[PDB]
From Swiss-Prot, chains A, B:
Protein known as: Uroporphyrinogen decarboxylase
Keywords associated with the record: Acetylation, Cytoplasm, Decarboxylase, Disease variant, Heme biosynthesis, Lyase, Porphyrin biosynthesis
InterPro entries: UROD/MetE-like_sf, Uroporphyrinogen_deCO2ase_HemE, Uroporphyrinogen_deCOase
Family, as annotated: Belongs to the uroporphyrinogen decarboxylase family.
Impact reported for residue 211 to P: In HEP; mild form
Lineage: Eukaryota, Metazoa, Chordata, Craniata, Vertebrata
Annotated signal peptide: none
PANTHER family for the chain: METHYLTETRAHYDROFOLATE:HOMOCYSTEINE METHYLTRANSFERASE RELATED, UROPORPHYRINOGEN DECARBOXYLASE
Impact noted for substituting residue 272 to E: In FPCT and HEP
GO CC entries: cytosol; nucleoplasm
Keyword Zinc-finger in record: no
Record localization: Cytoplasm, Cytosol
Species of the source: Homo sapiens (Human)
Superkingdom of origin: Eukaryota
EC number(s) per entry: 4.1.1.37
Length: 357, 357
């Protein structure tokens, strides 16, 4: 009972179909780089301006008012899941995302909620999605999302960010059983959560495995990959059993060059790439079946509009017009110029058409 | 006029020669994980217990008293070069390495010293090297080192660590000229510095390009690679002109999977790898000429001694007995157990011999 989709270029490319042009969207398009974002966000604290459907909806719609993006992604935070599981967050302006009381001992798992009840705790997200889907009025598709099991585990154990993930990785080596247990709890919670996002109106899903790079091939296939595979499999199964049409799923493994091959067989229609992997080599690794979502160095936007167009042109030339969705290699940075984001979007549209005509 | 080298396994492997066993050493073997290291270091501040030849010598020798490592690396800090160039460091216990006044404008380059005078400012390092070479009495080779131009630039612009290198990378995109200028100043200072380390007695050299991963292939070949190439070329040339025998040079580019091919042709005898690159794929990328220095996940040492031996066995099996020097994928972490470091060393020696016999 939602508006009929007008521009579905993003969805067609995601499924591997040919399109008149290359669709484009930016991770964190609804971000601090937009003056309007800080003002709206300054209404209250993080988990209040995130808990308000209308607020999340507005934040989601803001970038679309500035740029002809080919998709919108619901505004939320990957930390909503750990929170919904019973972990307290103290979002401060300086540090940012933080768990003042991180998991450290296997015993610390007892304080988490039964993953089965997490979906009911995230009702506000579902409401924001339905609302955003209604307000978008079929302009472009709406992407739902969540953090991958390993990445969420790193936040829960590290308590926040880290350049080494030493505490989280220590868990994998010293506490492999407890690590598997935590990773399973995270999977059992993400599935019903992601399914709920589709039920509420999400037309695609992206799983962010942002801390994939801290692991090597062996650990990754051992503790991260299995759950990345379980999420896609189970989400697809529940959607079919519920009578709903599965949506295209994207797996983003930042710094995951070493796992591109495994990921292309993980059950996701799209594989997101960071800027360190050359497009052509990525294509080799993933094959010719999956769609690659892709990688301009976000910092590249610091260059002039002219330089951006050229860098975009070269990026498209490497990826080729088939099975490709343009994007940045990572989320946008707070000090980036909105006008340069516009140039990126425009450049992708202009060149992708030339690369076809 | 130094003692004759008794065990040269490290040097032979570095040059590509066959050895009875695989030589092994650890980045940061002289590190906080050793109780004796903190005590000696607690004599005074960082740049005082580093400015004392006898102190640096003792720190260098400490790990060798515990483990039969096949090489020793002079104890120092990559930040000594920027400091010697005129930048003030305020080493605090919490943050660590820091420049309270980082370079931000092109004008900020004017306060740096003429790179030609940097060598004379680092005399204390040379003294510590000669002293350590004398005291080692030819037991094993002594490795000298420095940070690569880009990596040093990131510290000078960022003022310290960063998970994105946004300020440094902004320089590359917005200030490519000034970036090239700074990178050249850093090259012109490193060459005479590295040559001086050999003159003082260093029998090998390692260039740490620790922040290689923040750049992508394009930027890397554009701003990092050229200087990595200049260092090796110029150091070799000056050593020959001085009548000295060039030493084997190692290039370590952490998270530099994308540049393994270029690096193997950069003029270095050895290419250091981080733990994310599979040994076999690294071998493919580098070829069959260069020696690979290599990669156990430092965090792997959190596992039991038994598990470490197995992980070491598998690592050796992948690298093969030819052209290989065992090491960790990165420096040791402060909370690691000395006994587990011993097990790593022992495992490499035991298995490498079995892999031959």
């Amino acid at each position: 009972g939602f508006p009929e989709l007008k521009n579905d270029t993003f969805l067609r490319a995601a499924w591997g179909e040919e399109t008149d042009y290359t669709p484009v969207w930016c991770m964190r398009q609804a971000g601090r780089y937009l003056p309007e974002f800080r003002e709206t966000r300054a209404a209250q604290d993080f988990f209040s301006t995130c808990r308000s459907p209308e607020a999340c909806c507005e934040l989601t719609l803001q970038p679309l008012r500035r740029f002809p993006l080919d998709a919108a992604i619901i505004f939320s935070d990957i930390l909503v899941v750990p929170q919904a599981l019973g972990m307290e967050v103290t979002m401060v302006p300086g540090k940012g995302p933080s768990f003042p009381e991180p998991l450290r001992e296997e015993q610390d798992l007892e304080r988490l909620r039964d993953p089965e009840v997490v979906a009911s705790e995230l009702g506000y997200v579902f409401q924001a999605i339905t609302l955003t889907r209604q307000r978008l009025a079929g302009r472009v598709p709406l992407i739902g999302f969540a953090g991958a099991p390993w990445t969420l585990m790193t936040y829960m154990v590290e308590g926040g960010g880290s350049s080494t993930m030493a505490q989280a990785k220590r868990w994998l080596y010293q506490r492999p059983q407890a690590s598997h247990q935590l990773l399973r709890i995270l999977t059992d919670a993400l599935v019903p959560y992601l399914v709920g996002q589709v039920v509420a109106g999400a037309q695609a899903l992206q799983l962010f495995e942002s801390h994939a790079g801290h692991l090597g091939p062996q650990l990754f296939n051992k503790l991260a990959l299995p759950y990345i595979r379980d999420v896609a499999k189970q989400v697809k199964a529940r959607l079919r059993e519920a009578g709903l049409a599965p949506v295209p799923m994207i797996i983003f493994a930042k710094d995951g060059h070493f796992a591109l091959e495994e990921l292309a067989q993980a059950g996701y229609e799209v594989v997101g790439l960071d800027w360190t992997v050359a497009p052509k080599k990525a294509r080799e690794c993933v094959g010719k079946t999956v769609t690659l979502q892709g990688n301009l160095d976000p910092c590249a936007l610091y260059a002039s509009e002219e330089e951006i167009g050229q860098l975009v042109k070269q990026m498209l030339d490497d990826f080729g017009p088939h099975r490709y969705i343009a994007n940045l290699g990572h989320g946008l940075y707070p000090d980036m110029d909105p006008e340069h984001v516009g140039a990126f979007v425009d450049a992708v549209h202009k060149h992708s058409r030339l690369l076809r005509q």
